């Protein structure tokens, strides 16, 4: 349920996002801030320090994929469920990630946007992004519902 002003807030900011970087930043911070999530990324090699996490090329590459799916949801705000269906099967039925972590990654992304855009990330812009990341998290959790 985004209003047109909420939609404007979201798309005008997203146009400015570096899509090669921001997803790795959010995934890396998830792994640093919520370290239990490292359980799913054993194959990624050195996660021993925050610098090792943030500089790990597999974290950056994987985060690029993660952000690509966010971008696909931003383009389909009225059908997030179909947009996220195969990813919901993957994360829920195959990986068994607790869906609370979908909420945490969304909020980490919000922090990354706040850090990159500073004052431009106003309280109304944040509110619109909170609706988007909650909608993406609920769509990704559909197979638990």
């Amino acid at each position: 349920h985004l209003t047109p002003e909420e939609k404007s807030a979201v798309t005008a900011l997203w146009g400015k996002v570096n899509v090669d970087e921001v997803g790795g930043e959010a995934l890396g911070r998830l792994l640093v801030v919520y370290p239990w999530t490292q359980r799913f990324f054993e194959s990624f090699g050195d996660l021993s320090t925050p610098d090792a996490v943030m500089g790990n090329p597999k974290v950056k590459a994987h985060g690029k994929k993660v952000l690509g799916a966010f971008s696909d949801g931003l383009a389909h705000l009225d059908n997030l469920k179909g947009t996220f269906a195969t990813l919901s099967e993957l994360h829920c039925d195959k990986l068994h990630v607790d869906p609370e972590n979908f909420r945490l990654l969304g909020n980490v992304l919000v922090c990354v946007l706040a850090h990159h855009f500073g004052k431009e990330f106003t309280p109304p812009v944040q509110a619109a992004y909170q609706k988007v990341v909650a909608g993406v998290a609920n769509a990704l959790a559909h197979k638990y519902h």
């Binding site: 911070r29 925050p50 922090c111 944040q126």
Partner: protein, 140 residues
């Protein structure tokens, strides 16, 4: 909180400096707009932008957080009266501390270019989670 976490929270505190009360009010506004269920705890407030009441309340919240950081190894004692208030009188749902804490982190991110590194983000998250643990320790 580890020694490094205390170091990092202190770095952030010192950079925020005398803006803390303004940033507290901004974090409250972020919470009310992003999580409108939290508004019902403030029915007698005007929560509009520029509200003197939100400005005043954000200074109170900031002062409590600075008290907690100044007494970081004794936070249960430092925050005891506020823990009583939030659980017994205000009946704040524990979920809501996660919402305010997120909004406090976003506010810091929006004002701390250099300092909001991944490590300092983690340290601030742990500090706010520890404050929240004390403030939800008194339901009865």
């Amino acid at each position: 909180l580890s020694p490094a976490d205390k170091t990092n929270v202190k770095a952030a505190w010192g950079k925020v400096g005398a803006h803390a009360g303004e940033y507290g009010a901004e974090a409250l506004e972020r919470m009310f707009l992003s999580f409108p269920t939290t508004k019902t705890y403030f029915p007698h407030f005007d929560l509009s932008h520029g509200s003197a009441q939100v400005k005043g309340h954000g200074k109170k919240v900031a002062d409590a957080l600075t008290n907690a950081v100044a007494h970081v190894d004794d936070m249960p004692n430092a925050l005891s009266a506020l823990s009583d208030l939030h659980a017994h009188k205000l009946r704040v749902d524990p979920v809501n501390f996660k919402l305010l804490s997120h909004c406090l982190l976003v506010t810091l991110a929006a004002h701390l270019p250099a300092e909001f590194t991944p490590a300092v983000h983690a340290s601030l998250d742990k500090f706010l989670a520890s404050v929240s643990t004390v403030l939800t320790s008194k339901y009865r």
